[PDB]
Design a protein around this ligand. Structure first.
Ligand code: HEM
Length: 455
């Protein structure tokens, strides 16, 4: 029963483009998704995209023999500074498989034991910052969670300390980075390269890239000159060789990997932590369950790797937050060959499909009718969840390599926050989701009363 594909209103040669001409594109798309259903054709002047929203179709899109990772327009733009790092390479580019094969064992759950001490370091700095606040001062959740993630990836990545908790103005690198990312997203909604985009922006963009390249390159050069063997990712990349080709990574790719770990990892992981706290503070009974587990398990001044794995309920909290608002809301796919989706919608070779994750997670057919409710218990038995119903980390060989890293950190940090402080939503915050490459709660502020437990 092949059905015709819907489409929202168009604007001449500008097509549906104006439809997403807003500061909250993904959220608008979810709205359109509600109206048009599990699949719609979004057309732009010289680009076509089909957005999927149902587990029915998406489980078919996740068939790797039929569809493969497509570099969306945004990724192409991000490639200007992330080059051929894992995130912005095609599956068929030689450096994708090389870096993938080498980095894989370094991102396993087992490998987290080696990064744990470095994760604890930045975690304790966050707790102490909060411990030292004068009672009357509040906390800027997204802002602190961001400082937490940048520093953790910097330390675990290339053993470099950005020291974000010692300054107002971030390290110039981070500034150039957020700015480059910002610009990258701006080109996406550019009317044309001279509206607004002018030589001034392009100049700035090229300067930011220099700042990032200079720092990373130097660090890479120094490491191989000194010959230092730390437990960071840079060490693994300098001493690794692809089992297949027998080749090591080039210094430039290595640099791109490091930049990739930062741009791809920080915003999403900080967003995750913000939403989880948001939901916890809005659902007292859940917070009470989590705080008790945390106090019950984290019996030492500093969390051990083993202990973090015993925080079962906190894990459920993170997953449920990931269900409701996946911080990386979408990923693109293209058809390797002509085919039909759900035996209804015909697809041609190279057609792009954009998976709308937030909509996938709201599929009443899989999640029941209480999809908008925050209930961690629904992940009590993950094995009861259908395949391809929960995809916050992408699909297949192209899924987030930093998944275990993200979850281990988020679980460590949340556990420590719930153990040392009681949180107060003193302003009865109303959720405003800011969108960049990721999703994050804009302006979320809270107040934390310490339980005076030592670190
Ligand atoms: C909780 C936070 C995170 C979320 C929600 C998330 C989500 C995702 C998603 C959806 C993808 C696939 C994108 C696509 O198919 O186009 C992805 C890819 C990737 N992520 Fe994450 N991510 C998170 C944290 C991290 C962290 C901390 C790192 C860095 C260490 C990271 C590194 C990567 C890389 C390098 C890839 C590409 C892997 C490959 O294609 O070989 N992510 N992530």
């Amino acid at each position: 029963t092949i059905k015709e594909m819907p489409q929202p209103k168009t604007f001449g040669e500008l097509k549906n483009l104006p439809l997403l001409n807003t500061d909250k594109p993904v959220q608008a798309l979810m709205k359109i998704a509600d109206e048009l259903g599990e699949i719609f054709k979004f057309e732009a002047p010289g680009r076509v995209t089909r957005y999927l929203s149902s587990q029915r179709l998406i489980k078919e899109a996740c068939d790797e023999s039929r569809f493969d990772k497509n570099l969306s327009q945004a990724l192409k733009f991000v490639r200007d500074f992330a080059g051929d790092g894992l995130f912005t390479s095609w599956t068929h580019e030689k450096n994708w498989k090389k870096a993938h094969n080498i980095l894989l064992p370094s991102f396993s759950q087992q490998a987290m034991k080696g990064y744990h001490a470095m994760m604890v370091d930045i975690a304790v700095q966050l707790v102490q910052k909060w411990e030292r606040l004068n009672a009357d001062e509040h906390i800027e959740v997204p802002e602190d969670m961001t400082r937490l993630t940048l520093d953790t990836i910097g330390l675990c990545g290339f053993n470099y300390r950005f020291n974000s908790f010692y300054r107002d103005q971030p390290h110039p690198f981070i500034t150039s980075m957020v700015r480059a990312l910002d610009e990258a997203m701006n080109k996406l909604q550019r009317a044309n390269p001279d509206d607004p985009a002018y030589d001034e922006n392009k100049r700035q963009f090229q300067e930011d890239i220099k700042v990032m390249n200079d720092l990373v390159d130097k660090i890479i050069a120094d490491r191989k000159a000194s010959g230092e063997q730390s437990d960071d990712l840079l060490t693994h990349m300098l001493n690794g060789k692809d089992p297949e080709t027998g080749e090591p990574l080039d210094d430039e790719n290595i640099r791109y990997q490091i930049i990739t770990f930062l741009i791809a990892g920080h915003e999403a992981t900080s967003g995750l932590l913000s939403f989880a706290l948001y939901f916890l503070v809005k659902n007292p009974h859940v917070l009470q369950k989590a705080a008790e587990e945390a106090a019950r398990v984290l019996v030492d001044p500093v969390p051990s790797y083993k202990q973090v794995k015993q925080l079962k309920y906190v894990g459920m909290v993170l997953n449920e937050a990931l269900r409701l608002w996946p911080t990386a809301p979408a990923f693109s796919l293209y058809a390797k060959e002509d085919t039909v989706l759900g035996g209804e919608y015909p697809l041609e070779k190279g057609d792009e499909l954009m998976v709308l994750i937030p909509q996938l997670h709201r599929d009443k057919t899989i999640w029941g009718d209480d999809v908008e409710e925050f209930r961690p218990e629904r992940f009590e038995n993950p094995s009861a969840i259908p395949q391809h119903a929960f995809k916050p980390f992408g699909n297949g060989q192209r899924a987030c390599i930093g998944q275990q890293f993200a979850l281990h950190e988020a679980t460590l940090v949340l556990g420590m926050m719930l153990k040392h402080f009681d949180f107060e939503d003193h302003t009865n915050y109303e959720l405003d989701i800011k969108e960049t490459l990721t999703l994050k709660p804009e302006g979320f502020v809270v107040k934390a009363k310490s339980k005076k437990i030592p670190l």
